[model samples]
Target chain A: SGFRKMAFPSGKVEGCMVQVTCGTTTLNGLWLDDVVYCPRHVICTSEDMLNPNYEDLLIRKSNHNFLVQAGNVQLRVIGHSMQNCVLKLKVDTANPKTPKYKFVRIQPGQTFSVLACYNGSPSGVYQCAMRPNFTIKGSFLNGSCGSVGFNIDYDCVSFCYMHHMELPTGVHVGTDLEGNFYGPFVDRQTAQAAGTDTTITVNVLAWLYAAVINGDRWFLNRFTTTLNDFNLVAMKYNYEPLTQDHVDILGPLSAQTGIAVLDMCASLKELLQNGMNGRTILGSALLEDEFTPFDVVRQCSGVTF
Target chain B: SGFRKMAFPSGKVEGCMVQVTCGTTTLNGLWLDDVVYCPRHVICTSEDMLNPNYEDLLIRKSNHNFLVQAGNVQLRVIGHSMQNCVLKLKVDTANPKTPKYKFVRIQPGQTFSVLACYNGSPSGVYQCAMRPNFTIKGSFLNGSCGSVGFNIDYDCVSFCYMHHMELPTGVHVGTDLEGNFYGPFVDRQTAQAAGTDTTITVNVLAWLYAAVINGDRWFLNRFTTTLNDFNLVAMKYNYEPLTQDHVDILGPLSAQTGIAVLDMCASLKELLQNGMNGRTILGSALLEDEFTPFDVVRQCSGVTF
Candidate 1:
């Protein structure tokens, strides 16, 4: 009485059907149990909510929320409903137990006016125990992802300038501790907040510097640290910073054994700082083996020295 | 004697200087004209505000505004001041002449609650003539770009469900024309505005479809239109959507001339739609030869299909 199969004349489409299973005797995109032949496209099929073929795909920023389901045996996947997507941010505190930062939320991309503590000075100097350096960091977020159009107005200022090697752009940033690896938070006027941060400090800079200055037998990835192999890339790009005198240096204790080694920093270091964004550069001898300088230069539009 | 010659017994440090000429008579990181054999590091130098080697480097997003100059020939380069960058957006209308789409600003990442015209339905439907399609488009803005951290909560909706093959994820979004290339604007409840748009429309889709269905010869880039060469990449990924019967097809009317041609779309199109984000599936046969499926898949996390 509840559900019983009923029959109807002429339900299935012409040559493809014999009108067998009655009501709409067709699977449409699917197939029949004994159909002599089927469009090859329908042969390989699945009725899973998400077809086995495309479930949990690692979609791009734009593909995240557009796929949809709908109507009788049909799905109506749609797209953006005409709303603009505003970019967002995520703030993390390394030592959540003892917080050492303060802030207000911000927007209006591309200007430091929001962060300018005094006139153009980013933040006010506060006192603290000298330890390490970096207290904060920020990375790009996929905001309002859709058809990538032209460049937008993105803005901000780097506090702890790092001449990073791994990033495609050869730059990285961190919050400056002003030589105070851990300290109190304050406004340009003054501060009632006191705390500490312990990560990515000038101590890191000093260590990297000491190693470079001493030209000690140091080993990093095939990319940096032992920069001899990569320095050759310097010649390829025709880096015009200095003349012969700048590049002439001993090669890692004359090991020449071909194991690839670096004792001290030279033109490689200079070249990095020259183009990479930073004052007291740190992490220049980055550790990444993305493989070729040609590739690096290829991805690059130009050097923002 | 507005600029009288000043004198100081000792200023310069160590054997580097005799300190005779007075008032900081040294170009610390620079040259002293005839300073006998200075550290070669200082030999090749520039007093240019932006030293010659790296004046206008195309630095990464993070390097936008951190380099600062300071006292007595000293520069203090700092990094982030510990603020978050909320990504921003840039909205563009293809046909500003007669707009048919309306919108508010958007945010909050990964969810489409804001766009759901009717419980997950992206937007409302209206009426119009059969013209071309695409009226509105959105793009990725460099929002609060900073150092390389993990990733941020970027959010938005793809309006026009375009199977953009050029995008890295094999997906691109546009506004849906609802098969009405030109139409009216209204709330899901009703309409009060009228307009027409004519770019990237369904006419584009049907044209593409007619080409694919008829097996008509098409000339795209080395990557798409002619997909016989790229279909092999399908075998490489071991896609489980269909079996051998699925891939069986004539390869571009047997074009062994080696000039490269595509008579119709096949498994290549299947693979694109299967994993890319869309349903109506316009623009699958894209034009772009970045060279190599290996590279495309390398950047890909996984196909949505």
Candidate 2:
């Protein structure tokens, strides 16, 4: 009887319900009248409900002690807790109908990394939650374990650095002892200090332009990582990336845009020094810095991004 | 006229037939008279019918010489037949229009493992089929291979043991040499007599629960073996255990209900000893046996169970 009325509607069976009776120890189904009904028993008593507990349903923010970062397209979860912990991530996309969920458990003071892609493609927005359950009084705040959020964009230079280019010291963007992700971070501590507002776009954008104009053997190594990053960003934004099919798309732009690329890099650096206030302006300025060249290529090559 | 009218009525279509004229050795499409004709020859002489010497529509079930089990959530196909075999699993969900199918080949006496999750999540009901196609006798039984079935539960403790805990003797649940999975036994002697249906789940469940309650710090080494088991289970189940969020949910229950937990272990042992009846009852008994204890901590720590 706990959820009887909601089991049935005015004229149809809107949902499923199981009823328990105290007398005669009866367990049966009932289709009650004059009540709204829905599946998974959304309108049932706590005793009768089959829902996961508050903790399971709780969505955590960042645990402060832990750290999460993104490199290239991969996201890493680093544990700083005294004991083992489990995490849940939901990649919220443009379509609410199709959200993706991922789960992972990490040992005390360890790090675990996984690809951010769901269905072989990265998500644009990632929301993460975690909890450390070693001690009787582990971490739990509000209704969640600990939560953090991040956005995805393809960084061509980082992609090439990680996947294509070789370095003298094997050092590249986003590389540090702490194993933090590539971002507009001066260092691991800076990114952590910035907390949740951390952004990777500025780092990626700056590095990509700098490398594009400065590297001599830019076309070498199949340019494979560029295609990879391009496609990832392209897919996230719902477009196609320039491929080997359109190598010529960049030929003209590459030659004349070296000056513009250098100019934009200097501008972005200056703006970034001024703090987050200049971020949007830097983005717009960079938009024009290499737009004529990239636009010609994107159009001629028929690549969307 | 091939596959002419009445080719497939609201009733059945039987006895392959094809009609070909000697004068016209050519194949052509025609909308012939009132009879109404179609391609692939709805009607044709038996000789012209493309049907194999045997009907390809046969779906066979229970070759009576093989076994299926779960190594964690991975389904392992164990061959009892004296020859190599191939298995097919069709997760026939409500979308009958678009059923999902997976195929694996077993090396005669060996077992093959695969995730029970379809498209990255466990199917509600897993009905698996397998067959040995060494001879012309490849596919069979009403258009299917031999089949067996299993169900899915989150298996939180097993989930945690595999994802969170280190083991002693390096042995953990879902650990086995054959690399196959959970199953419907054809009896030990018959399977081993035939050399299949190797036990894994019973051993794993018994060991995991025993070690959880009794072991101190539990790491007596051999964690290497346990790690392998954990990966296999994690791969099949498509999740790491929920340890952090569940600590509160299980702590109180873990302290007070060790007796109940032990009792359920005995109950499951008895039910299991009675032999596999319907797997549903085994599931129900196991549910009651372990569920309450799991619930208390889920309440205490506010972990969702």
Candidate 3:
């Protein structure tokens, strides 16, 4: 089994090396795509994209066009990494153009620039699934779709404001239109937005201050904008027994400086009752499912811990 | 060690029998409240209130007063049940009046008329912890407080519109000021309202349809305005395996009249993806914790069962 080279539009006898083989799984009822052993062989669209530079595994930082051909039925670029660059995929599964699947995997920092104004069918809309931590910082979603819409699954690092695009649920972290973060609890469907969407739940700071003030910061120092941050916090705290540390945080209160006294676990219970009735902003359903600060506090009151 | 009769303002020589007991627990420090066999009894406050009808175990229907005395210690009318009446408590815990605790039990649809505009301290605010299913139907919570806010811990049956008062979390079931149904999962703190508060999540019907469409209706017929409704719905469906019943709902789609065909489990997955992104209005964290329709459906996709 050797390799056959595909030519670009100018028939420049140079392109990707596609291994040619025999009859296997067929596509479109006309072509066989399997690289199996057989007596005969024919050209079929396998998962191969035209690499202008023919680079392997390099993270794209500059602008590039990724194109695929009809000799290629349907596929995406696997193992390709992108960052801080405008990547445009132009493969028309319709006419089968090469050099674009209209996608590139983002790593580090980069942006995919959406160009064509999409219209017509949202039915065929390809959901751009990216790295959970990678966010989109371009405006391709800005004025892009004239068509139905696209569901962008990551947080918008930049302007994703288009009536056609939908974003995940989040809080108002940024003033005005700056994107707010959706705590791990909020789901994309709960409070979806068209351009850049999120929900206005309780005060964001209320959640954080409580999360910071209440729970152990073991998760905080370990937390960044990664996906794993909250649940670990929620799960651990949700089931953990109340400790003297919780009561100790209350400490003693004095006007300026005087002999202080233990605020007692009673006051903390009062805090649960009054300050936030059992909920804090940082607590997500993800956190909530495990348990709530309220449940934890209520289960063991004033203090046994 | 026997009954003592106290006169009302009219000075009737007769009142209900309050067994005179001795020093036990104390109130306000100046008085001793012991039911023990110890000596010396002066009239401090015991937990006795004036009853006009002298009835026992009877629920009040026509508005009545429930006053307790400073002479009488606190503690609510625990065993009393009220329905369809505007009961009032006139005890000035201030100077000590009687015929009311101002608080009564609600079981059968009654009302509590709160008079005397409250003022000054929210610190002293007594959180009205009513029966979870029993709600307030009167204007006591409406125009009553002049001082600080009070947290009302049940669903509002009528006008609870005082900026000082708070209601639990619920969804909008009513058109405008009517009332929304909060699933069992929504907590009081998540999205609290001043007068009458609730959070706007997804379309309420989306929850119901998916819940009804997805799960068995065993919980529905058993569900009413009580507290135990949603979690059972959430828990059972969250873990229940996807069955042909799920696929059966998709059924055979036909345009007007044609040969019907299975939409298949694949279409259902599309519904999970597009109709709602792994969420339906009805699914809750309580449900999510147990699991979500999305989790359940996603765990087993397109169908194996």
Candidate 4:
């Protein structure tokens, strides 16, 4: 058999399950689906090796990497271990020989900070690693139990966090004598990069409806403009403005009349019957001087002002 | 002893008090002053004519004379006598010899009719006289009670009463056998004379108010026309249609801005703030080629559109 189904009741496997044969026994374990496996003493199963329970158990003190002035660095750590254990923090400076380490006793829900900066003279960029400090290592609970580390760079200028970038509110920092942490208002900028953007859309019918019902001035004014535009077109074609008499005699609806009569009468009918936002188009192509009768008829039939 | 105040308190008198001398006796009556003095057979006061109670006791049965065809003519009379008396109806036809007379017995509130037409009748106009048959003949009351007479005129062509006059209903007409009283409906011409003529006086503010309040189509259409007219004027002067923002910032009221600014902005402001009735005059004249801006401004300032 080239494959094995490893049961991971409490663990999550993120990659393929694989099987391996050595002598008469088959060794199966999980590996990253995209990563090439290297032979080692450990039996790798696609499912077992992919279990992420231990890494899930570990808690990151802070997910962000911060730049600090050259001096000291303080990293905060919390113990999310299932049982009481020793949490170790190791600091790696630019000078490899000047590396520092600190050990702290931790229990469930217990937390402490590690001082990585030195007092006397060392100044440069540094990185740190943290883990439960124990001799037993590797995949004891179906996942990697190695240290999680982050870089701590140095800057003597105390670079400001540009507000435009929308950086985190507080960062951990250190001093020469002892490691410390502080939250300070750093800088100001004009951008509002952190806020969301919103947009609005309006429909003409809906808008007219609102104005008609609410008597909104802005909408009514715009509607009146459209009506006037139509009227102008009608006048250009020599059709008189629609009056009550015309509407009363012709009927209040455009559909009631033939297209020929409607063409002659559309503008007035629309204005009198429909009012602002009247849908009937009176004519096309208002002329610099006058509208030809044909243009008026065609425009009215077309139904756009 | 020459003047005696007659205590005839029951009668009401009007007109001038007059005095008259009959033979040696002097008669005085307070004719117009609501007072009475008695002396002569016929009474008189300073500014009034005399009165005769005996003739005043008589009354005519009918004040209107109807022209009847052929055979006999009849007239009616009534007696309001203090004591039993005879009432006479004197028929005076075109032929004076054909003048006939009739008398009737009467008492208070008693009534009768007389035949005034003759058998061998004359085809001509006739007059009739009606009174209490008394020897004394003079005015007993300020009004004519001596004989209320009327003339009867004849026509060969019988007239017909047509109800085309559209007269007000419910007026009283007397009953007569002559088939007489006519409600004449006159000549017909297409003059629209019967229906009332309606004149509509439109004040812009009032018109707009009606439109705004009632949403009346007529008012709104008229208003839209006005706005378009103003807009045309503005365009002639190279100005745009007014907007709400312009109106708001400039102030809806005319007096808020000086006339010069108003002249430039009048058309738009009038439309947006005041609606169709907005009274800002936009320009002096509109032409095909171009408009004089100063003239527009001056015209707007002068306030007639």
**Per-residue lDDT for A172-270 in model 1, tens only?**
122121211112321121223322322221122223333333232243223334344434543454322222222232222222223322322343344
Model 2 spans with C-alpha error above 4 angstroms: A1-305, B1-193, B201-305
Ranked by DockQ, top first: 3, 1, 2, 4
Query: Can you rank all candidates by TM-score, best first?
Result: 3, 2, 1, 4
Candidate 1 segments exceeding 4 Å error: A1-305, B1-230, B237-258, B262-305
Model 1 interface DockQ: 0.01
Q: Scoring only the second chain, what is candidate 4's TM-score?
A: 0.13
lDDT of each: 0.20, 0.21, 0.21, 0.20
Worst lDDT run of 10 residues, candidate 1 chain A, spans A1-10
Q: For residues B1-305, what per-residue lDDT tens digits would candidate 1 score against the true structure?
A: 00000011000111111111111122111111221111111111234212322212212223123221112222222222210111111112111222122222221111111010111111111111112221221111111001010110111112221111112221112212121111232112122332322222112222333333323334222443433344454335432222222223222222322222232234234434453222222222232211122211211111110
Q: Report how far off residue B25 is in candidate 3 (Å).
A: 18
User: Candidate 4: where is the Cα deviation over 4 Å?
Assistant: A1-268, A276-305, B1-258, B262-270, B277-305
Using lDDT, rank the candidates from best to worst: 2, 3, 4, 1
Interface RMSD, candidates in the order listed: 35.0, 30.5, 37.5, 62.2
lDDT of 2 at A245: 31
Candidate 3 deviant stretches above 4 angstroms: A1-171, A176-305, B1-45, B50-283, B287-305
Residue B247 of model 2, lDDT score: 33
Per-candidate TM-score against the hidden true structure? 0.15, 0.17, 0.21, 0.12
**Candidate 1 global lDDT:** 0.20
